[PDB]
Design a protein around this ligand. Structure first.
Ligand SMILES: [Zn+2]
Lengths: 137, 52, 190, 138, 172, 197
RNA sequence: AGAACUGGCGAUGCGGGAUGAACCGAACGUAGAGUUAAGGUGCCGGAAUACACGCUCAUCAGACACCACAAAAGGUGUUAGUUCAUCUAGACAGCCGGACGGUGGCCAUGGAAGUCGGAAUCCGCUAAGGAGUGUGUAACAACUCACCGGCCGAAUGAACUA
RNA sequence: GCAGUCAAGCGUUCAUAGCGACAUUGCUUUUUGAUUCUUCGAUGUCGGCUCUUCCUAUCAUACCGAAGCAGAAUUCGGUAA
């Protein structure tokens, strides 16, 4: 065909309204959103839903999300929480495979040996079904 | 027997050049500095002297 | 100062196509096809339409930036070659000894053959690259031409023919003989 | 000096924005130096034409808002290789001598300004057959 | 030479019977404690007037917090620094949130690009640029462009373990 | 955490890898390395080659054959590099070395085994892009090593067989992910998921 | 080689300085536990391939006081900075339009109309225009610059410093 | 002993093709000195011969650059032991 073809790296851009995960620090396991940029490696964030205070940070302690919402620059924390709720971004985050695996391993940590034996027996029964299931087909 | 057009044409390749006063290299005539590391990429150059 | 974003722009005209995948470039047009690999540069691309591409660098230094332009220029050179073609005319030069020039094929090798350079008994043989084609001029004397879509091969075999007939031990300012590039342009638009 | 030369240009512009009641913003795109001169000798009757840097045209007209406030709306029309033909003669005469006579197509009339009014120069060429349909049909 | 703080330090000659109520001088000092602050205060006051710590007195040392430690600001800093064979004046622009963070980054940057040390550096002025386009420097201006966005390519996983089983990716 | 540790030479950095291998041996893990020729070395070929040549001229002047031994082959290159990081004149160091194995390409007894990677030693991870570097097979065959082309031949021979195996396994996993979803929609699966599985 | 003050070595082990009489730390009964020193934490080697800001890529890098050396002079390599200058009354760069009239200005000649050469550098209209910076014709035709204007819109040049 | 910087000047003109005053920074330990650390209950204290190797600041040979290189010849210089 005549159609020119290219792949372009679809990167998570650093921007305003961009929601982020905290990797390190006291707010590990939390989410927040950017307000403003300072340099290549420094930004300003707030996690009022998550309960993070408005603050600057280096980006090494943080990973971007694939998610993002609409937000003007310099938004104070109240407006930030407002737009966060309006966009319903934590809801959307919960539907991630990412958050699900996270809460999964959180459970896996929280398990009790009784529950682990339960898990074992359940795996065994599931497997007994699945073997003869994947015998005929 | 040999004509001035191709004379100048060849001079582009043999004469119309510049020379390092240190690295003795054969440089583009309009260059400012020597492209050679050993002379410190210096600026002290000259033109290749002309014949007769 | 680590420029945060810079970019250059590339036009794609009608009848042309391009395919980019992991810095592996195919460029197809009427003359044929041309391929290249640019994995030795870390850069991004973007089709915006079938008429334009952007190339871009994020957060690059000075020398990192510099490659964007030459890469763009190289792409443009490929495009111009696959559409218009490239054509490099030289001229022979001599004052006493007539430079004898022919072509000759060893197992289809197509070596250019040169004799009588300054009266030498030496026969010089220069292979012909692929995709490049040669014509002796008839309307005008001693004007032999190369042409092809690959500027690299064209220019290189041309300069091969240049530097192969390099005089030794003699004041070239007087001894100007050789073969010298007079003109370079395209096959198309004359 | 050069700023005085910019001032030298600004003065003649105000000289003609004030001395003349009308002006024709004319497209001087593509007009030759010989075509610009032959427009003068025909315009030596009334009209005087003033060229310069459009940026100096706008920056000159931008400065004229204390008095001459209705000159504000020339600035949307200070674009491209264009120029003013300041004149007091009637509309269609200078308009035709600009547009029809000594034209090579190729100078048109971009805008005609007079007493804080804007004409698109199209109804300006209305010869007849427009008032009869208005007066008779009314 | 640590994470800094800003103090205002007010100090005075000792009062005499001749001259009581001497002429309170204040300074804004970037330093990591009041001790260093008082030291530098006397350093500078010695340089300007015929006074020293022995004939003088410090009236008050007060820490100044930023008024808006979250609003991202653009500072201009006028600096004096001793080189190896000379001393020089500078104006540098820094986009950061607080004066103190700007000063931290400035000392690191001058040590990096000039191998200058704190002992060698005098800070003449720190001033906020209220309006953009009064900024003079491109490496700050490229962040003031409207609706700025860019990615962070080549994300590297610092690994908890020594061994991995799958050649990771720089996608991000 | 294993009896054996099989490692790919590819994409790594020599000294980094050698340090970590050294400490792992001296803690007592048994290690084995493959595809050494695919090592990456920082800095360009010319610099690395000059450094080898300087290393190469140094010899016991009165008798060359007892002096330093200038092994060319990439395996022995990494071997030397790592021996520099060990008290190999110890019986403990000699034990640590006996715990080690190194290979070019990847022979049968390991190619059918899992083999792993060491992020602290990876070029792309550690070494900044925009920087040049060097390939160990190129350097070795430059400086007197012979058997490169053989490695290409054997490794392609292997890789085809590996591809067939992987695709065969993939079809089986697709079968699995098909036949298991039906039980994924089952009460036991629901309970396991409630438990975090 | 010879002096002043002090501290050391000699008469003194120890930890570090790889090695080392004198340096750094510290001075010693025999043992244990804890905390440090100077010094160090990729591996040899015990200790973070810790964090952060930036600089640097060397066809001869650099890598720790004592200490095991280096300069003068240079560099359109790179970084950062100072002074000056052009420029938002629109600059530079780059594109773009005019590149005229008195006028083919005067001599030179087979022809030389702004561009083989020799001699004058004048005037008009001009936003501006050289009696032309050049390609091209046998010579005109046909373009581009000097100079000026449309476009973008804030940059552009030089000399310096480390 | 050797190498650099600057360049008034030579080089018909032309500082720098090649030279280069006035100064001036360095390198080497094959000169000779200075010192006297080691050895005087003992290092066999010129030169030659024979023989192996190392250096390069290359005399020749390889490939090259520059010239006041027309050619021939010669010079300056480079990667090179
Ligand atoms: Zn040179």
């Amino acid at each position: 065909s005549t159609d020119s073809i290219v792949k372009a790296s679809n990167w998570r851009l650093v921007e305003v309204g961009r929601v982020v995960l905290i990797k390190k620090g006291q707010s590990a396991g939390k989410l927040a959103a950017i307000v403003e940029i300072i340099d290549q490696k420094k930004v300003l964030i707030d996690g009022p839903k998550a309960g993070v205070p408005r603050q600057a940070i280096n980006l090494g302690q943080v990973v971007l999300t694939p998610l993002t919402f609409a937000l003007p620059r310099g938004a104070r924390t109240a407006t930030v929480s407002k737009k966060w709720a309006a966009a319903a971004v934590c809801e959307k985050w919960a539907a991630s495979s990412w958050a699900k695996k996270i809460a999964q391993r959180e459970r896996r940590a929280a398990l009790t040996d009784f529950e682990r034996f339960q898990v074992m027996v359940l795996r065994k029964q599931k497997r007994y079904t699945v073997k003869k299931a994947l015998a005929k087909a | 027997i040999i004509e001035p057009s191709l004379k100048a044409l060849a001079s582009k390749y043999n004469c119309d050049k510049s020379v390092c006063r240190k690295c003795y290299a054969r440089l583009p005539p309009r260059a400012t500095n020597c492209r050679k590391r050993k002379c410190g990429h210096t600026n002290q150059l000259r033109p290749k002297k002309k014949l007769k | 100062m680590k420029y945060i974003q810079t970019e250059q722009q590339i036009e794609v005209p009608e009848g042309v196509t391009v395919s980019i995948k992991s810095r592996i470039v195919k460029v197809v047009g009427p003359r044929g096809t041309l391929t290249k690999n640019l994995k030795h540069i870390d850069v991004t691309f973007t089709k915006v339409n079938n008429q334009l591409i952007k190339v871009a660098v994020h957060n690059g230094g000075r020398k990192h930036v510099a490659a964007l332009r030459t890469v763009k220029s190289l792409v443009d050179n490929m495009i111009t070659g696959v559409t218009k073609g490239y054509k490099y005319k030289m001229r022979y030069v001599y004052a006493h000894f007539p430079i004898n020039v022919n072509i000759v094929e060893k197992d289809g090798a197509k070596f250019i053959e040169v004799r009588n350079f300054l009266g030498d008994k030496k026969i010089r043989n220069v292979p012909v690259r692929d995709g490049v084609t040669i014509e002796f001029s008839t309307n005008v004397k001693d004007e032999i031409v190369l042409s092809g879509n690959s500027v690299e091969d064209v220019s290189q075999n041309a300069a091969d023919l240049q530097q192969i007939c390099r005089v030794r031990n003699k004041d070239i300012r007087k001894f100007l003989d050789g073969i010298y590039v007079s003109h370079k342009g395209f096959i198309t638009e004359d | 000096g050069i700023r005085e030369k910019k001032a030298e240009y600004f003065a003649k512009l105000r000289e003609y924005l004030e001395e003349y009641k009308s002006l024709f913003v004319v497209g001087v795109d593509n007009v030759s130096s010989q075509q610009m001169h032959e427009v003068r000798k025909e315009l030596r009757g009334r009209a005087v034409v003033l060229m310069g840097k459009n940026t100096m045209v706008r920056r000159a007209i931008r400065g004229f808002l204390s008095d001459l406030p209705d000159f504000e709306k020339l600035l949307p029309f200070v674009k491209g290789n264009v120029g003013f033909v300041f004149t007091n003669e009637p509309l269609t005469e200078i308009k035709n001598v600009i547009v029809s006579n000594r034209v090579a197509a190729g100078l048109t009339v971009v805008q005609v300004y007079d007493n804080g009014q804007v004409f698109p120069s199209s109804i300006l060429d209305i010869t007849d057959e427009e008032l009869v349909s208005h007066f008779v049909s009314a | 030479m640590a994470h800094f703080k800003e103090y205002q330090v007010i100090g005075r000659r000792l009062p005499t019977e001749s001259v009581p109520e001497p002429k309170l001088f204040r300074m804004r000092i970037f330093a990591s404690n009041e001790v260093i602050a008082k030291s530098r205060y006397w350093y500078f006051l010695q340089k300007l007037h015929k006074v020293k710590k022995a004939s003088g007195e410090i009236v008050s040392i007060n820490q100044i917090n930023e008024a808006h430690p979250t609003k991202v600001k653009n500072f201009g800093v006028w600096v004096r620094y001793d080189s190896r064979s000379g001393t020089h004046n500078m104006y540098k622009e820094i986009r950061d949130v607080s004066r103190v963070a700007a000063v931290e980054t400035l000392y690191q940057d001058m040590a990096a690009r000039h191998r200058a040390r704190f002992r060698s550096i005098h800070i003449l002025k720190v001033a906020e640029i209220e309006k953009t386009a009064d900024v003079k420097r491109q490496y700050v201006k490229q962040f003031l462009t409207k609706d700025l966005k860019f990615p962070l390519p080549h994300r590297v996983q610092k690994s908890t373990k020594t061994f991995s089983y799958k050649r990771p990716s720089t996608f991000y | 955490v294993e009896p054996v540790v099989v490692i790919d030479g590819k994409g790594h950095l020599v000294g980094r890898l050698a340090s970590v291998v050294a400490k792992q041996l001296l803690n007592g893990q048994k290690i084995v390395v493959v595809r050494a020729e695919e090592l990456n070395i920082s800095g360009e070929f010319f610099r690395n080659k000059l450094k080898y040549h300087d290393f190469l001229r140094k010899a016991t002047a009165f008798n060359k054959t007892r002096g330093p031994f200038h092994f060319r082959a990439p395996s022995r290159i990494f071997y030397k590099a790592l021996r520099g990081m060990v008290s190999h004149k110890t019986a403990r160091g000699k034990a640590a070395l006996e715990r080690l194995k190194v290979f070019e390409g990847i022979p049968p007894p390991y190619d059918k085994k899992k083999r792993v990677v060491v992020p602290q030693a990876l070029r792309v991870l550690r070494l900044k892009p925009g920087r040049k570097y060097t390939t160990l097979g190129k350097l070795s065959t430059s400086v007197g090593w012979k058997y490169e082309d053989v490695v290409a031949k054997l490794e392609a021979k292997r890789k085809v067989s590996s591809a067939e195996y992987y695709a065969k396994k993939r079809a089986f996993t697709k079968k699995v992910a098909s036949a298991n979803a039906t039980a994924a929609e089952s009460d036991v699966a629901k309970q396991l998921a409630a438990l975090g599985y």
